[PDB]
Design a protein around this ligand. Structure first.
Ligand SMILES: Cc1cc(O)ccc1-c1ccc(-c2ccc(O)cc2C)s1
Ligand SMILES: Cc1cc(O)ccc1-c1ccc(-c2ccc(O)cc2C)s1
Lengths: 240, 9, 236, 10
């Protein structure tokens, strides 16, 4: 099934090559910004990244092999998680700042403008600091990001010939674990160090789920009281 | 859904 | 810290011994279920389990080494996750059902009266079936429960470094268990990844559950113990 | 303080 035959080095290669581009914000000398304004940049940004995420997902080995319904469910569950780990990744070398775009580099005080954002901000920063302290490697990040796509929604599927899908997603997931271990052995880590590092990486995914949960809550809070049609749809999936 | 469309094309 | 001095076997033995008992529900089979009465049984049950949890937590190696303020944070963050993994664990041998208590064993239909309960129920059943398909062992479960306790709040903070080395010690223990079970080395790292990725879904379930709980608490559906109120408040 | 704090403090 193509993805299962891939080698560890080919998986990395496939993932690195699948990477989306880094979009810029439409922030300008308009300085400064209000609650509305800052919110606009974030959502416009996320909206535009969503298009690229979808085409990136199609290139995640094993994703195409799934039904259109299952692909949809995966992205619906994962999109904000995927955006967030992206953000924290490119914010790694910017302690105390969140790099939404090369031209949009926010510190936590700017996050105060916009309610409840602070707390989400702090969590993203702490995650970024954690990645920094672990010296997260780029090849590890693409594995983690793919893992999120495949994992975050797999348990909200289901009977019938759907178990065939779940099993396929888990075979691919194992492949990616093999790939992470491979990257670690290559890096020279001992066996004990590999397992430990694997564990450390995956536990951070729980925190990333938590941030998406909260963020999704706030995003919904704010749309009740201008988000793109796509965003709104991606958001409705988390509210039955 | 829009997502359907983007996934198809 | 003697936590770090523990061997894999000492780690497992400590955790198995610290296990809380299976408690019973105030279930009364003379009255029909209402949203309020079901929520009553559930929250009464959770309340009593919490006391046992607080005492179990103090027995998780390393936990005692933290400040009271940090112990409070971790429990505040993880309490529902921890109740949920326990529930999912004891429901393994009951396909299609959730054993909240030996006298409170429900299927998805019995929760329809309750706001959001069927949604969470379905998620819990899925996790239970997954643990069942993977053949989760008791020794692995207690490792998982302790990881949740130590991990779920550590990012919302030295002490943080102390927690990580305890967690590493639990990773060594999980692998040790898997070797002892005769899994290949590749199977070990694959199983480790599978188990930990399920924690992301337990996190998910906790957060969705928390939100339904807060909704109901704000609609006065059921009187909540002051303990539960404060744990519930902790999540804003 | 918090009931949780007392319960732990005990
Ligand atoms: C989640 C959220 C909650 C709020 O209360 C306010 C704003 C947001 C956000 C909207 C878009 C965000 C965003 C944007 C771009 C990106 O590359 C990654 C992220 C994560 S965050
Ligand atoms: C969280 C929740 C949401 C709803 O919509 C309806 C009910 C609940 C629950 C209340 C108590 C629950 C519970 C209780 C005891 C236990 O050992 C494990 C759990 C999980 S679940």
């Amino acid at each position: 099934s193509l993805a299962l035959s891939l080698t560890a080095d080919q998986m990395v290669s496939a993932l690195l090559d699948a990477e989306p581009p880094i979009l810029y914000s439409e922030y300008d000398p308009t300085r400064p910004f209000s609650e509305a304004s800052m919110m606009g940049l974030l959502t416009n940004l996320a909206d535009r990244e969503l298009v690229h995420m979808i085409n990136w997902a199609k290139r995640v080995p094993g994703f195409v092999d799934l039904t259109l319904h299952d692909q949809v469910h995966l992205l619906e569950c994962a999109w904000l998680e995927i955006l967030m780990i992206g953000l924290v990744w490119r914010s790694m070398e910017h302690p105390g700042k969140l790099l939404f775009a090369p031209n949009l580099l926010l510190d936590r005080n700017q996050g105060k403008c916009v309610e409840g954002m602070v707390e989400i901000f702090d969590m993203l920063l702490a995650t970024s600091s954690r990645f920094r302290m672990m010296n997260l490697q780029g090849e590890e990040f693409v594995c983690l990001k793919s893992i999120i796509l495949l994992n975050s929604g797999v348990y909200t599927f289901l009977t019938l010939k759907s178990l065939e899908e779940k099993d396929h997603i888990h075979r691919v997931l194992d492949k990616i674990t093999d790939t992470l271990i491979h990257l670690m052995a290559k890096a020279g880590l001992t066996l004990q160090q590999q397992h430990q590092r694997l564990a450390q990486l995956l536990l951070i995914l729980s925190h990333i789920r938590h941030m998406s949960n909260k963020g999704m809550e706030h995003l919904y809070s704010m749309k009740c009281k201008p988000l793109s049609d796509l965003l709104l749809e991606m958001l409705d999936a988390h509210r039955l | 859904k829009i997502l359907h469309r983007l996934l198809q094309d």
